[PDB]
Amino acid sequence: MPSTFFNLTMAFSLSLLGTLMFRSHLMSTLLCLEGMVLSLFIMTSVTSLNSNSMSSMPIPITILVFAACEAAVGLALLVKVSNTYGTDYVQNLNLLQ
Amino acid sequence: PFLDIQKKLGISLDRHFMFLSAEQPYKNAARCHAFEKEWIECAHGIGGTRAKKECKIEFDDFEECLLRYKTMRRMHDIKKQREKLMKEGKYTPPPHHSGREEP
Amino acid sequence: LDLIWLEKTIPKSTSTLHTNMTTLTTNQKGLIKLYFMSFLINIILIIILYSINL
Amino acid sequence: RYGLLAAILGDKTTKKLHEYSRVITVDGNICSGKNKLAKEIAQQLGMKHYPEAGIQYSSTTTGDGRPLDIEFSGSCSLEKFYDDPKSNDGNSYRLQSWLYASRLLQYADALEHLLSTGQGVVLERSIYSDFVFLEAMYNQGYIRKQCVDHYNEIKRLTLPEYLPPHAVIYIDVPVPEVQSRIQKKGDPHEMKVTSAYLQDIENAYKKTFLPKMSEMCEVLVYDSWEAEDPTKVVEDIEYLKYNKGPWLKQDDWTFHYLRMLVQDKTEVLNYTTIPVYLPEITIGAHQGSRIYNSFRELPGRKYAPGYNAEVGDKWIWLK
Amino acid sequence: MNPITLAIIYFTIFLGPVITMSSTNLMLMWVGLEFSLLAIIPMLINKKNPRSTEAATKYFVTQATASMIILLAIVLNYKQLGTWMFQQQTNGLILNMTLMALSMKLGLAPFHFWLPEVTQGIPLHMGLILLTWQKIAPLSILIQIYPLLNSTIILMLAITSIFMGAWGGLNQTQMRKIMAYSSIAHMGWMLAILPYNPSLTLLNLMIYIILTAPMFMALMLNNSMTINSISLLWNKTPAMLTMISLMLLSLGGLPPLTGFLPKWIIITELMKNNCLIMATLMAMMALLNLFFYTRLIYSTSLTMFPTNNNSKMMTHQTKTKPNLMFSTLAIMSTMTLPLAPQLI
Amino acid sequence: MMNGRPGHEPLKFLPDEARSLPPPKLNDPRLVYMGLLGYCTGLMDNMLRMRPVMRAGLHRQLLFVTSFVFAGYFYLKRQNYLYAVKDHDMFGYIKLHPEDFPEKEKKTYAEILEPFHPVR
Amino acid sequence: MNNYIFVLSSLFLVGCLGLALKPSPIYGGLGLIVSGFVGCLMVLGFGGSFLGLMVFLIYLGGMLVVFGYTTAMATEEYPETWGSNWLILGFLVLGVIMEVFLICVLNYYDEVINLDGLGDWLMYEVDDVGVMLEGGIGVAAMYSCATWMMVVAGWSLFAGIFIIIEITR
Amino acid sequence: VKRFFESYHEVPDGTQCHRKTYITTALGGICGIIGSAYSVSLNPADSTLEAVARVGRYTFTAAAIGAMFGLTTCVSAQVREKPDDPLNYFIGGCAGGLTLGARTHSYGTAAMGCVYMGTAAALFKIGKLEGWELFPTPKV
Numbered sequence A: 001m002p003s004t005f006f007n008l009t010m011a012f013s014l015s016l017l018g019t020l021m022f023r024s025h026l027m028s029t030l031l032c033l034e035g036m037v038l039s040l041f042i043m044t045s046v047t048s049l050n051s052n053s054m055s056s057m058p059i060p061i062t063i064l065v066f067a068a069c070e071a072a073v074g075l076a077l078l079v080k081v082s083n084t085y086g087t088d089y090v091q092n093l094n095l096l097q
Numbered sequence B: 001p002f003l004d005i006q007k008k009l010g011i012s013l014d015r016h017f018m019f020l021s022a023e024q025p026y027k028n029a030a031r032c033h034a035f036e037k038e039w040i041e042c043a044h045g046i047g048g049t050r051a052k053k054e055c056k057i058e059f060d061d062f063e064e065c066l067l068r069y070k071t072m073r074r075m076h077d078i079k080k081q082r083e084k085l086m087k088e089g090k091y092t093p094p095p096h097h098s099g100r101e102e103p
Numbered sequence C: 001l002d003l004i005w006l007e008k009t010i011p012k013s014t015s016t017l018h019t020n021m022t023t024l025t026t027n028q029k030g031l032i033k034l035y036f037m038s039f040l041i042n043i044i045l046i047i048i049l050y051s052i053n054l
Numbered sequence D: 001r002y003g004l005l006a007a008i009l010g011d012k013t014t015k016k017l018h019e020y021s022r023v024i025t026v027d028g029n030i031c032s033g034k035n036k037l038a039k040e041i042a043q044q045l046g047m048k049h050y051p052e053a054g055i056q057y058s059s060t061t062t063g064d065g066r067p068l069d070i071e072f073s074g075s076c077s078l079e080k081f082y083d084d085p086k087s088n089d090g091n092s093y094r095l096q097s098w099l100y101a102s103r104l105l106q107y108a109d110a111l112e113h114l115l116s117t118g119q120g121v122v123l124e125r126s127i128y129s130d131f132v133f134l135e136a137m138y139n140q141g142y143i144r145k146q147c148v149d150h151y152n153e154i155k156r157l158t159l160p161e162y163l164p165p166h167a168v169i170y171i172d173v174p175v176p177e178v179q180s181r182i183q184k185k186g187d188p189h190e191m192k193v194t195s196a197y198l199q200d201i202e203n204a205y206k207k208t209f210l211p212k213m214s215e216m217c218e219v220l221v222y223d224s225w226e227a228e229d230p231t232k233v234v235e236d237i238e239y240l241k242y243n244k245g246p247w248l249k250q251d252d253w254t255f256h257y258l259r260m261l262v263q264d265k266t267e268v269l270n271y272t273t274i275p276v277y278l279p280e281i282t283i284g285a286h287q288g289s290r291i292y293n294s295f296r297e298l299p300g301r302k303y304a305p306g307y308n309a310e311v312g313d314k315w316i317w318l319k
Numbered sequence E: 001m002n003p004i005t006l007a008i009i010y011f012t013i014f015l016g017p018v019i020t021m022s023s024t025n026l027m028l029m030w031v032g033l034e035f036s037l038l039a040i041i042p043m044l045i046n047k048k049n050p051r052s053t054e055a056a057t058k059y060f061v062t063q064a065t066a067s068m069i070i071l072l073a074i075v076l077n078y079k080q081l082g083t084w085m086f087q088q089q090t091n092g093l094i095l096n097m098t099l100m101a102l103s104m105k106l107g108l109a110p111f112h113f114w115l116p117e118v119t120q121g122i123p124l125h126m127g128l129i130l131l132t133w134q135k136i137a138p139l140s141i142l143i144q145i146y147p148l149l150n151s152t153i154i155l156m157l158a159i160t161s162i163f164m165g166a167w168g169g170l171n172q173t174q175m176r177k178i179m180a181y182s183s184i185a186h187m188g189w190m191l192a193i194l195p196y197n198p199s200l201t202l203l204n205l206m207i208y209i210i211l212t213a214p215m216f217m218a219l220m221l222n223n224s225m226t227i228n229s230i231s232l233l234w235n236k237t238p239a240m241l242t243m244i245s246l247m248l249l250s251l252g253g254l255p256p257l258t259g260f261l262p263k264w265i266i267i268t269e270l271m272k273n274n275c276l277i278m279a280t281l282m283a284m285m286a287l288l289n290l291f292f293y294t295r296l297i298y299s300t301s302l303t304m305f306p307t308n309n310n311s312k313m314m315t316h317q318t319k320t321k322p323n324l325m326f327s328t329l330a331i332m333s334t335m336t337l338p339l340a341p342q343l344i
Numbered sequence F: 001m002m003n004g005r006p007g008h009e010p011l012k013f014l015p016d017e018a019r020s021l022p023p024p025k026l027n028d029p030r031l032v033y034m035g036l037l038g039y040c041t042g043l044m045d046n047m048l049r050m051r052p053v054m055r056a057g058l059h060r061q062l063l064f065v066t067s068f069v070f071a072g073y074f075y076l077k078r079q080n081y082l083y084a085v086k087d088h089d090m091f092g093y094i095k096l097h098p099e100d101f102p103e104k105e106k107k108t109y110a111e112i113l114e115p116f117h118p119v120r
Numbered sequence G: 001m002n003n004y005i006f007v008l009s010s011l012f013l014v015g016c017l018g019l020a021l022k023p024s025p026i027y028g029g030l031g032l033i034v035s036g037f038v039g040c041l042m043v044l045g046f047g048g049s050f051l052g053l054m055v056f057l058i059y060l061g062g063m064l065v066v067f068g069y070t071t072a073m074a075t076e077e078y079p080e081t082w083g084s085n086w087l088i089l090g091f092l093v094l095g096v097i098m099e100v101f102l103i104c105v106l107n108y109y110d111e112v113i114n115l116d117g118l119g120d121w122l123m124y125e126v127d128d129v130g131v132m133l134e135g136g137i138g139v140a141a142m143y144s145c146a147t148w149m150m151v152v153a154g155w156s157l158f159a160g161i162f163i164i165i166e167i168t169r
Numbered sequence H: 001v002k003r004f005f006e007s008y009h010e011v012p013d014g015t016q017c018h019r020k021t022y023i024t025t026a027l028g029g030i031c032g033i034i035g036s037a038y039s040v041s042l043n044p045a046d047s048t049l050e051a052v053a054r055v056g057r058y059t060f061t062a063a064a065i066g067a068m069f070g071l072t073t074c075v076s077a078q079v080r081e082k083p084d085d086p087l088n089y090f091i092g093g094c095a096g097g098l099t100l101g102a103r104t105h106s107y108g109t110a111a112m113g114c115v116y117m118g119t120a121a122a123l124f125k126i127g128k129l130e131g132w133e134l135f136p137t138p139k140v
């Protein structure tokens, strides 16, 4: 974990760099967004497991349950967008200028 | 917290499980339960501003039960020398490493 | 000195300084990628602001 | 009041609908005899008949109901429309814009009666059949191109929200014929109507109005002879299937919101007052302020309905 | 909306901030933030106009990544202290993350780009909720953790917001976006005093809520999203012209009205704490905010813009009234100043 | 700030300790202001809703002048307590930690020599 | 073997590198699945079975199947852009190698990596003679000890349906 | 990598101008990079090169204002022999204002710039002289 918690953390930052620099398809962000939730879920589960802190295992899952719906909302917005613009491409999302 | 509707109502839906020394299921004590207690019964009645200087012995220890980095260091240091010493042929693992086995 | 020099210097200049500053800060594509990247820059600088003043 | 509370507890439009809960708008030329037909159609099927919406369809609907002074009602003359086409002041466009606002009020009042009572409504000409006058006016020197754009913008902003006419009974006495009818009638001005105007209006009905509402709503065109006989048409209206039409998706929980719109006249025509400053439409601050201080000072208008003592309202000190 | 759905959503949009405030286990504070994100998105697309889908998709991505960053801070803390909550010992970077993240959800400073755009594509009503009942949640989390956050960053985000908000507002003519910009600015003052006297943040918020809620129900009474639209207020409904005038000058800091108190006591507290550098620059550009407020004043009240004949028609019809809240929140806001000592 | 104080009532409006403080005189200028603040709210409402300004809702006018005032007595009653706690807290500390707040001595103006800057 | 966890952790990072470089949406999805499995094995390496396997059930086949599903109807075909998928592949490979040397560099800074201390820390302490100390016993506090954690999540799902249907409508 | 900038303040003003100018030039340049970055992230360019150019322009312009500020203030101090004088800085601030003006090819900007920038720099000197505290810790 000393260096196994640095890989996961950098994974979250590499996923951070991803969600923040868009490119074309919006799905790739959402998908990326999810890459973080996995990294957070893995790190939370890892430390809870090596702290033998069983009282906290509820959290690793609450994180996933909330993250799943969060993503559900995200995809419905995505479907709504390629119903209004025929694509998920972000450039289209420039009307509010 | 910002609106303590919990203390007022007496309910404790969010406090019972905030620290490693809270009730663990089947009373399987956590790790560092020897310290967090010692570091929160110390900082009880003494506010943070003064839970941060005088109750530093118990956090410096609890910062080491969990992180357990000084150990890692000492150990890592030990190995290095053992590596160098083993280079000179000075250190030869004892058969104790492969001795009898205590029940 | 009245009218032009004392109106171009204090009252009018301050009018222009701002007008121009709003024009650059508010001329935004509206595209999300651009905006977001700016969030990236911010995270970077704040990471540093903490780092250097550790 | 009508609101979610009422809707939550019953007060559902769907429960109040029936074979004859429909909107039938009969549209024709300058004189298509459509009023007569509309009246009868409404009676035969037991539906409310809404008179054509004139420059004053709003004062009658609001307050005393007594004809407001011209300047209070937007200073529009159909009379001046005819005697002075392409006028410097543009009374013709102001007449058309007020007319669109009047039918917007009439259509909304009609929808409110339809969803509340459940009774159907015959509205003669509608917001849907107003464009033919403007199309003909632009085809003529009456209105300029931007004037057209301003009406189209108001139409695009407000008309889509309201549900379409269920069916659009139509009469088609030709321009030569109508010109004859008008002349036989005594109106000194109506008679100065350019024949071309009549034709252009007719065209915009056939080239645009009937095909365009035909796919979204049932269309029943009848010639002069057919209309004289409403019964004939009533039959057709009854055999109508109202199969197509955006009306099919109007569930109760959807009607509620539409009702709450028509229930609020101030919104129905909210986009009718959009701040687009074309010169004919602009009242002008000094003239507008005066007309307001004067319209707002009329008895029963200086305060909300129920609170102005002039007309005999009482209990104001506890309302 | 099937009234049932309306209830579930509205309950969530309301359980969302309330769980955040009540709980102490940060995790439970995070899901409170998460529920607010999920509940607001359906309402945002109610018209389902092409502009709306854009609004929600931006609001959601901005909100979601910030939510993930806040969770990372909680996850990291869990390993630097077994506790699920920030403590004196917390690594400084851990807290700074929470500031940036929470300053994105609240939309302060260099993350102020999403708010003006989502405020532009949502209805006036959902605009209010998106501006004022969604700021309570994140601010609660910050106010709780104030003892630990950095004085430097907050100040920078504070000053930046004030500037960005002001400068942005000067150019804007769409009302929804003028308000979005004001909110960025006021939000800035609020976060300036958080490290020093959180109790004043809660005043500079309430007053902002008691000022903005009347201001928006005013904008929608005539549903005018344009200044030109609000300028014809004199014809559509003349009485609100008087209070709209005072509330907007109150939103800016002019002295007789209630709006001065938040700026005055924040400046008094910052000078008490010696930031006479920072406080001075903030107050100065705060004056820029009043310029665009008064420019609107000019169009709506002090000068009468020309109106349209079709307006006479809207006058005829009885104007659906403004709820009572407008009055009670207009007066308590425009003039409570004589009662400042007890407010603070 | 004042939160975290010993004995703090976690969600209470005004702890009974505030009973010791004098009650706000009903005619306290402030409560009277709240009254006027209220009457105006009422009048304003009538105006925005286009009703005779003063002669209408005479029942409402009362609800307003009487709601605001009611609120006042019970609010001021508290804010008065909060301020009173502040002294209890402040004065106490000055003593418990006396050295830090010593009573310095001020010399008579005779002894003190203040530089005289002539105006000329 | 002692590096079993470092390696897995390393591959995870790469997996995430892939998602970041934003390859074609569906291939990116494949990436999240690869990282997903790697991750599951990580949690399954520190002693947690339920938490891990759940990752599989809810997230590997459960959640991303959806992602791939929607990435089937709405994310177009990533058409005329497929070529980059090769460039992205390269940078990924190059980046991986970069990191390879990178961590070697960080390893140099003894002042964590515990190059020698690898396999000495995946686990720290265990109730050697214990019986009911299995990941999961904890996950169940959600029904009894901690229920808040369930009442909150439950509301989420419930409200979720109403929300998604409302957004979708 | 911070012990550096601070050095500017440690040695008395007017002395060791070399260091002063170097430090001031860096700060300006750093700001240049950051400024260009925001300028490129938002209001993007048309081609990679075009933007690289921007970055360069903004960086150099900022580096220049940094240099002249540093050089002018140091030199003025040395020549005027006033080791600590707010004006010295003003001369320098004005100088930066002018530079910026030139790089923007505008006399007017130079006017705006001379007063505003100078005033600002002068205030920095006063700030240091009077021990003004910026971004202070909460001490209530």
Ligand SMILES: Nc1ncnc2c1ncn2[C@@H]1O[C@H](COP(=O)(O)OP(=O)(O)O)[C@@H](O)[C@H]1O
Pocket: D028, D029, D030, D031, D032, D033, D034, D035, D052, D078, D081, D095, D096, D099, D130, D133, D134, D190
């Ligand atoms: N939008 C409009 N523009 C101009 N004139 C209109 C408009 N709408 C109705 N009119 C006029 O109103 C008059 C009455 O309409 P109609 O009912 O067809 O005549 P009648 O009442 O004699 O049957 C018509 O002569 C027509 O020219």
